[PDB]
Design a protein around this ligand. Structure first.
Ligand SMILES: [Co+2]
Ligand SMILES: [Co+2]
Ligand SMILES: [Co+2]
Ligand SMILES: [Co+2]
Ligand SMILES: [Co+2]
Ligand SMILES: [Co+2]
Ligand SMILES: [Co+2]
Ligand SMILES: [Co+2]
Lengths: 283, 284
């Protein structure tokens, strides 16, 4: 169960995860694997398909709620780059992973974007923000965002009917012609209508298969494990707090169990809508 | 002002147009020109951009309300055909026009689809169903929809900031690269997930400029003028009815306001849908 606080469509909006009416961290307290190494991962859905609001798990706040990303001091909405409407997958991230910013990847030759590893979920169901769902990984794209390592995992909700026919990245291309290309294009151009340069990619933009994913994911999990393990070491501004026992059990940054500070601002529905939710950009 | 009755997301949903608390016909009573042969047309918006529900003016019901299309005894929803999400324009129609089903067009060599002429409005704003919008025409696509003439006007809302950097169809291609092709693709494949064939096109798919467009529109207007022109001829099923106390000239099908007298159902809010409002279908 997830719960909401503050006023929606504003900076004061926060969404926390709970278990048993008791808050846990989206970042740290959700296991990376839903089911063993039977290649079933937990995905945190930040952004529903065909939506424009850039929701993110917040690293800088206690319990790591999902909140609106902000730019300029305004709520951030991504652009519609023709022919796409908003995010064209359910977009989010794998818990207990970290794109380490002091670590250079030999294949992107860049450092990490300081956030959990990103996921694009491609099932037909539109998942609401804050959902936690089990996914099979199919492959991965080596995005170099604004000069930072920004791997994008390709995955599908394991209860989707296509999950059976889709076992590796090649299957995706056979059943979804044009989909992989549109996906590269999306990440390539999506900041151009903000005046930002085109993004680039590792391996000349080649989607790598599910075996090369898993390995990359496991690496980001090790970094997360190091960030949490102990490393009693200031990784500026990320709050590493985590709860119950175990969860994570070894961590120095553990505590138990907050509850009290989960008292921020009772929720309130609000004035919706603002920016370029509506406009088409041609890039 | 538009006014609603019946239960939404159901077959009993009906949206009527009124002026001054008095209903008028979406089909017959909204003038085709918002501003004479000063370049400007009225468009009835049936379908907001990026929605899937197929709303349309009802032709067979008094006052011609907008309602859900229905096939196989359930509400009709359009497929998402990759990479598009529902309708990729505000979709609708020009009032007082008619693709005459007894009329064969020299360029499509086919008869009309018995509906008013269709419009794709391409401005930024997403318009709710039932809106009536002043638009400038930029071009036309000669679509043959399952064998019926089904011209699709390309137009833009005159208050959109693009409204004229865009003066003709060639300007659309310049500022919106890919848009025209994606638009023909949409109409080509949109019934393929239903098992139906690909649609085809007049002039091998060519978008014709606005001068050609306005010519076709006039023709569809002259047909509507014949349908309504007191023409005492039973091509109904279509209700040619008009109003008001000074609306459609001296159409035989005008009346007083028996239209107000039609009280029905009263509005009601209802459960959402499910089907494949969500699903992606893939056809090149
Ligand atoms: Co970020
Ligand atoms: Co992210
Ligand atoms: Co990024
Ligand atoms: Co990232
Ligand atoms: Co029709
Ligand atoms: Co129509
Ligand atoms: Co049609
Ligand atoms: Co039609």
């Amino acid at each position: 169960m997830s719960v909401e606080r503050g006023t929606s469509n504003s900076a004061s909006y926060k969404m926390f995860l709970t278990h048993g009416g008791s808050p846990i961290s989206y970042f740290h307290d959700v296991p990376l694997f839903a089911d063993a190494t039977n290649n079933c991962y937990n995905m945190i859905v930040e952004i529903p398909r065909w939506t424009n609001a850039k929701m993110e798990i917040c690293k800088e706040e206690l319990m790591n709620p999902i909140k609106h990303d902000v730019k300029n001091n305004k709520l951030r909405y991504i652009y519609n780059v023709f022919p796409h409407k908003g995010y064209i997958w359910n977009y989010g991230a794998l818990p207990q992973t970290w794109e380490d910013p002091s670590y250079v990847d030999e294949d992107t030759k860049a450092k990490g974007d300081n956030d959990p590893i990103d996921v694009c979920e491609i099932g037909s169901k539109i998942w609401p923000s804050g959902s936690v769902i089990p996914v099979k990984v199919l492959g991965i794209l080596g995005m170099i965002d604004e000069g930072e390592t920004d791997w994008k995992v390709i995955a599908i909700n394991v209860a989707d009917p296509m999950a059976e026919k889709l076992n590796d990245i090649l299957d995706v291309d056979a059943h979804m012609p044009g989909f992989l290309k549109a996906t590269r294009d999306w990440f390539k151009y999506y900041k151009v209508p903000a005046g930002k340069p085109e993004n680039s990619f590792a391996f000349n933009g080649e989607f790598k298969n599910k075996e090369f994913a898993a390995k990359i994911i496991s690496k980001t999990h090790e970094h997360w494990q190091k960030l949490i393990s102990t490393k009693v070491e200031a990784g500026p501004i990320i709050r590493a707090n985590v709860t119950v026992k175990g969860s994570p059990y070894m961590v120095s940054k553990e505590d138990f169990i907050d509850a009290l500070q989960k008292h921020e601002d009772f929720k309130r529905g609000s004035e919706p809508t603002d920016q370029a939710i509506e406009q088409w950009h041609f890039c």
